[PDB]
């Protein structure tokens, strides 16, 4: 029942709603036909069924690695997706800004709980630019059609942590 | 690693015209799914394009032809029937439509005292496309800086160069968008004949003791009096009248800073308002002055 | 004869751990019939074909236990007759397909002293085990008798005090459920329960 | 090739304080005109400074001392009496005066739905100096971008970062001008408690056929309902009434999208208007909704 | 009675009024005590008394050389005079813009009258920056306390030209 | 005794070619008296001291002919007695010092058919030779008899039709002159001339 953990869960729930809404808004204007993938996004494979067992270090380590990759891709989109996708601002930019804060919010969490910090990992090389404006939009469905799973798994994962500390 | 693409990249077409879109699949993707041109399906804005409008040009490309375009914005998407149950997106393009800009008409400019030259023009039929308006201006042996219209107020610009009286300037506006470029007529004029001075201020009504049927008006003319000779219009009525009266224009055809209004009813309150403009009537009437009240002695 | 047509497949899930999918023949023309069922986890670990066991060993339904909650699964239902196949492939994500059952035990009670207040209470559905990670949000609707239009509120928890009940009139009340993180879809409406605000 | 200079270059001093200005002549100019310190005359804004206020510190420099500065802007000029008839300008400086900025008080921020965080504060006594206002904001382990106030609206800023609900943010304003720097109190708050949602729209009044004394209100809540639970205030009166009535707040303390108003007079027209805010009363009341009219069956 | 000559005279008369007004406005806010000089401005020495005799080539050649130097100095002021003199805008900038046009107006005049054009002269090296903000203002009195003599001598000189062609 | 005090010097010019300056003793204490007069053109050509000749050879006035119109001159009037000097130095620019004489021959006439119009006419002053380079601008003032406040107009040319004359009343009219390019200063007012608008 930490004071710090309730607040972080609230922002993930807040961010999850923004991401689901933006994904649905995006599909309304630029429909997607089919499951879109990007080789660079992480696989979020972990079963909620067998999710209780996983203790405190794994949830926080996994969220940071997954969320950091997603931040780069959202940030990447606002640079090169093409004029076709300018219509998702400012909603897409607000998501970028709030998502950046949540990654920051997680780093503060690790310091206050005095948990061993992961080693400064080597940043991933740059993503090639999209091959077309529509290629960036198709990439956009994949990037924030995935970002509402990482955040979804964060609310679920963080609620597990509250049950312990 | 897309499967293919649609060409042209992002076309803009004219309303009621024809448009043909071609979707081409890369060979590597075609091998992977074991498909060909006959399996391409087109969708737009969540609407399935009816199969009868498709045209297989070759096993690598499919095409559709739109006639009488009536949508301002058409989102076109190309999808493939890979297993024959699951639809996957190949490519997409945005079709924007509209009209070329109409030739600007009723082009006019105005020089408000203390401000830079401003020009206004009548835009024609709505074009539904982002249309840029650029004010072009040149004197005769050198062209001075351009005005790119702001999204707000698409019919007006305020130049970035200071107004220069007494020199003929050639001005025109060029309207251009993805479907066309057009220029207004090349009107030619001297800014000195397009001045809209500010109205006179410090207007005062004074009660002369002698001749209880006479009132003298005084005021300060606008600074623009240093370049042109001003003409004014003084209107007056009784404090209770509903309509304004007017001094004979011939009596006020040249620069002055005072005027004595006569044949007014004794010990009656009168309200005055004034405006001024260039002596030759070439230009624009200024706005109405501040209201003024007065009472005879 | 002719090869089988594609079978019609639907999946569902009323809880967060296991889900299940069902299928029906689209045509009763192939007399002998059998079903091949399988599924895989699409990537971007042998995630290949895993059998979908058929529960009372004859029904038109198989269940997948211990499914990955956030991953997407491609279910392969294949109709086979002595003459061919017409595999139906159906994409399913546990986070998308989920739909809880309506709340249970909905009761509506008057609120003494307040002629236009009612207290509504209800319980979780039995198919949803109460667990701290996945709550459910609830949506309550109430309508006075003989009136045509519903009013909607979004209660916190398992209770809701209605404050705009028409005085002296029976009220119908029904509720529906959805995963608290907006996963899946809203439940079907509960059976209506009736109550009447107290007098005074 | 000036003759000399005044120091300090361009001072700013506090009202009612003392200021000493020193004018120094270069040696080369002094030789040319055959003069010295006793010949320096000071002038300000066309006013000759009275000789009794001068102080010759040495033959190279003269000085004046101002007490109880009361002018917002003082133009000081130093001149020399070369031949004793002709005055020539040696140097000049501009003296600007004012007050240091007062500590901002009543600091408050507001998050209008769809817009970025905006903060307002009460400026204190006029300072007569160009005073910059900078909104400082930081969460706890990193400081985010600053708001430099615009000349227009000196008491407000609209941040350049998107609003982030559910995280406590430390905010304060620092006011600074040539005479001083000061900071507002370091208030601390969560933007979620400073939201001013837009008012409900699509408000509809409907005439139920049964129970001619009952009318049902429906409307669409503001998007901000996804983060906080809303509370509302519904006011109503008869089409001819002069004052508004109000539903008991206790009956409307939590999010909902409809309400049935009872005990209304039969076949009478009623006008409604609504506003909403966060359920705990922490924040700001929204603006009034669009007006709505209705008639019972 | 050339159509071209009347119009140019009108603009010089217009510009003269602006310059006199700006010089007087400037002296009102930043008084000057004494006659200010700059080594770089031209000496406008020519007597109106013995001014009739001078024919068409001299008036136009002299105005261009004098006015070109004055344009540079006005333009120079808007770059480096110091914040103290920012108060003379936008009036000072309008003078710069109109003065530039009049120099241009004179070059057009020479072409239309088919007069021999002066050789492209070597531009003068840069003026050192002012030693102080007030040094720039003192320089300003000299620059446009002189520019209302060149223009003054232009109206007078151009009226002589009208009397001939 | 004591050295002379600085003499008092004024200059003036009613035309654009020559100008003239005058000086008076500030004190009649130095009995024998004589004046040294000179002037130079300040630069930024022996522009040194040039004598200022005294016209009827005894008066307190010297004239400079063929002066540079735009240049600035520094006039040096020096009082000398057997005991010293007190040179007065006075800066003068022909473009600044100039002041024309008032217009001549001002006449005001009624305008038949218009009971509130008058036609004013006047001529150049004799000290200003009409020449195309230096016109004069004019400023006309008119005032009805017994009234205290003047009305001002700025006529083009040597004539002006007044349009706000009070009907049936004598009007006083006076005018002043200035160089048409705002050089120097406005003239003194002409002598008033009277006229009365026609009846009808
Ligand atoms: C969905 O599941 C069905 C059921 O397994 C899949 O059908 C299978 O398809 C493969 C071909 O890809 C068959 O392989 C066999 O290979 C041998 C050796 O050449 C040959 O003798 C057979 O005639 C056949 O080609 C396999 O037999 C068949 N399954 C069964 C039970 O017969 C189907 O491919 C799946 N759909 C997917 C993965 O999209
Ligand atoms: C204004 O004009 C007067 C009149 O000329 C100027 O007075 C002159 O001043 C000079 C000194 O600068 C005198 O020079 C003489 O030099 C000889 C040789 O040393 C010496 O014997 C004399 O006693 C005197 O110093 C000159 O005599 C004197 N003029 C006359 C007529 O005596 C005055 O300087 C001028 N003011 C200026 C230019 O500011
Ligand atoms: C199949 O048809 C498409 C139709 O576009 C062909 O693509 C064009 O190919 C020509 C080759 O001469 C190029 O010049 C064009 O630029 C191509 N246009 C597009 C939009 O692709 C394609 O080459 C055809 N393939 C075969 C094998 O005939
Ligand atoms: C005359 O007085 C002035 C007063 O300022 C002197 O100027 C100062 O000189 C000191 C020398 O120690 C410097 O440290 C200061 O920075 C100077 N200030 C200014 C404003 O000039 C000047 O040196 C004195 N001269 C003599 C010969 O005593
Ligand atoms: C295609 O274009 C032609 C000519 O522009 C037109 O006549 C025809 O109606 C259009 N549509 C078709 C052929 O479907
Ligand atoms: C309209 O003007 C903007 C501003 O520079 C420009 O970026 C855009 O390309 C213009 N649109 C055209 C030329 O169609
Ligand atoms: C100078 O300053 C002192 C102290 O600030 C003050 O008492 C005095 O009145 C001021 N003015 C003078 C000395 O003229
Ligand atoms: C006020 O802000 C402006 C904007 O950058 C800055 O240039 C100026 O120096 C500031 N004034 C101060 C710090 O006194």
Author numbering:
A (entry chain E), E (entry chain B): 14 to 178
B (entry chain A), D (entry chain D): 4 to 300
C (entry chain F), F (entry chain C): 88 to 131, 141 to 296
Authors' account:
Interleukin (IL-), an IL-6 family cytokine, has pivotal roles in autoimmune diseases, fibrotic complications, and solid cancers.
To understand the molecular mechanisms underpinning human IL-11 signalling complex formation, we solved three structures of the complex containing either the cytokine binding domains of gp130 (gp130D1-D3) or the complete extracellular domains of gp130 (gp130EC) using electron cryo-microscopy (cryo-EM) and X-ray crystallography. We obtained a 3.5 Å resolution cryo-EM reconstruction of the IL-11Δ10/IL-11RαD1-D3/gp130D1-D3 complex (referred to as the gp130D1-D3 complex), and a 3.8 Å resolution cryo-EM reconstruction of the IL-11Δ10/IL-11RαD1-D3/gp130EC complex (referred to as the gp130EC complex). D1 of IL-11Rα was not visible in the gp130D1-D3 complex map and was poorly defined in the gp130EC complex map, suggesting this domain is flexible. N-linked glycans were visible on IL-11Rα (N105, N172) and gp130 (N21, N61, N135) in all structures. The interaction between the binary IL-11/IL-11Rα complex and the first molecule of gp130 comprises two coupled interfaces: (1) between IL-11 and gp130 (site-IIA), and (2) between IL-11Rα and gp130 (site-IIB). The final interaction to form the complex is a coupled interaction between IL-11 and gp130 D1 (site-IIIA) and between IL-11Rα D2 and gp130 D1 (site-IIIB).
